[PDB]
Symmetry: C3
Subunit: 149 residues, 3 copies
């Protein structure tokens, strides 16, 4: 039983030119790229993405940092929602475990390179927000017999 | 005092073509390759390898997964038996620490890329099962003065 | 608010020829190289570097191991003193976390590749010991807006 999660490379990942390295970490585990799109995030879409934080004092500055190119992604794998969160590490890079993306690349939570859905409900909501269903692709990895039990 | 451990790249490691990356992780610590052999594991040798699991319901499926090309290896280093296990990570890739082989490469316990001896006694037995004494090579690493106290 | 830490690649790092890999790990987090110098460490400077250990039985052998080529470095970043220590890992490589320098490269505490200041006071003392003020270079990283909050 595989699932799908929404992962988004933030403008710092684009500008620091580590997109390929990020994607490689997920491919390395045999996670399948089900969707991928470069866009420029705008305030209106970011307000929906961060709807839970509406009205909080940090939100305007967060939206400013996130207004920029982003890489929208859907990855598929066993337990991939929780596993992608583990691979990213703590939101605060100083707290993140060695070997996680945030510990390996970042210093502060406001520039922490990447977002991943925190739950199945948020993955469904985020995938619907950032992608049209047409953009989710169905295919099977040829190495499946050696990735899955 | 150094010791020697038995490490085996399972068919998923061969088929996903990550053999070199696996070997590089052990070489990076100054562990010495004392033996290395590509073979195809067969049910009869795997029954002996997995002797501790005789009679258990999961043994037949385990032997099927492991029937295939494998890379038999012996690495030498300080505390290398326990350290190689730490480097491999937990049996379940989803529980393994980031930076371990299983966390970085795998999704499920039944395709977890690599075996390593779990104790001094199992290392001695496994090395003897998969290698004849004439296959174990003794030489000194030129950087020994900078690897060992 | 950034700080500066003193990091020194020990003779084993030089001789194993992993200087570039070590530097890349710190650059990867957006830490700024503020100073760098190759020298051959002398007993006189090492006695002051290891002043905390004066009179201990292991000091003479520690100085001997360190009398060789070293790369003196200053890196700047948020919380970089504590963070560099976390990236180095435990003094004993066998106790260090996977993904740390010592766990990934080393076997024994007496050859553990790198030194880093352990506190604000130690960083200030060690930077002043190994570098003259004119050797500390002040410049701004062009990617600062994407590294810092």
């Amino acid at each position: 039983h595989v699932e799908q999660t929404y992962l988004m490379i933030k403008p710092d990942g684009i500008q620091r030119q580590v997109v390929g390295e990020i994607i490689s970490r997920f491919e390395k585990r045999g996670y399948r790229i089900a969707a991928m799109k470069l866009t420029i995030a705008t305030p209106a879409i970011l307000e929906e993405h961060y709807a839970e934080h509406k009205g909080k004092p940090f939100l305007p500055g967060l939206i400013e940092k996130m207004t920029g190119p982003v890489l929208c992604m859907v990855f598929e794998g066993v337990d991939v929602i929780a596993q992608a969160r583990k691979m990213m590490g703590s939101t605060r890079p100083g707290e993140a475990a060695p070997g996680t993306i945030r510990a390996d690349f970042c210093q502060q939570a406001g520039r922490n390179l990447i977002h991943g859905s925190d739950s199945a409900e948020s993955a469904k909501r985020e995938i619907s927000l950032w992608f049209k269903p047409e953009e989710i692709q169905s295919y099977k990895l040829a190495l499946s017999d050696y990735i899955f039990e």
